[PDB]
Amino acid sequence: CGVPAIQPVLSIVNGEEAVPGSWPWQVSLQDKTGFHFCGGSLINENWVVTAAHCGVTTSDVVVAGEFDQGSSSEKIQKLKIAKVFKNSKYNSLTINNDITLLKLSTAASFSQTVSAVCLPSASDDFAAGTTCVTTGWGLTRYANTPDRLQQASLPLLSNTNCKKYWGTKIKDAMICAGASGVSSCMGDSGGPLVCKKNGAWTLVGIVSWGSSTCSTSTPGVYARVTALVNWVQQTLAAN
């Protein structure tokens, strides 16, 4: 996990186009018509982790191996969803514990453009200031979504610095990043916020919420995976 067959080239609003297939765990969650409503991350061949607010159902599909959503010829894997596991602690009012697991009906065929992201340990500590990356097909301007997968490097923010703006809206299962010239935006939800752990890309956050206009000078908020990974492991073990 966490090691792309195709290495990404570093250096979403104000982000940049990604090297095709360089973020193999990135998936697109679409309805039966092919309409993209959220992103997600493959954690293995049978499970996808996304945001709870995305409201995924078994009628939606997981699309893996995609780069250009405007390309009808591009080879991709449309995977059906067998069951949806929304974290029962998801707070629809505070948006805390914003995580959901998707169990695929048919396993994804891992390849050069389709593989898993690593999951952190509940005790992992990713220092504030750490430069991580987020990806997705969300708006590039706050408007239709870009056809090609976007990426952006951004720093993790300490809870103290994040709260300097969001105050008490920041809860224990949330982690902030951004306010650095880039910003996740509509369509990026459920997508990954990854940081390297011993050289391997690891899921530190899940795009959740933020500025109502996707301001690049405001902290972006993500579901803190370290606070939710035990729930993830328990769910996988029991299913």
Add this chain to the structure above:
Amino acid sequence: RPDFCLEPPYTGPCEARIIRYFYNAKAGLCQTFVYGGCRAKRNNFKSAEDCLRTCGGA
């Protein structure tokens, strides 16, 4: 009809791209809009029919 039917559509702070319907009093019909996935206001419906049954004529 409820006054919430007269409120403009509310995307919210979450970053999903979910299609929902809201009643547009200026046009007299329910239109689609992108909902972010959280903190929906009441003029937000999952189908045009639900919207028209709740806000039609406001």
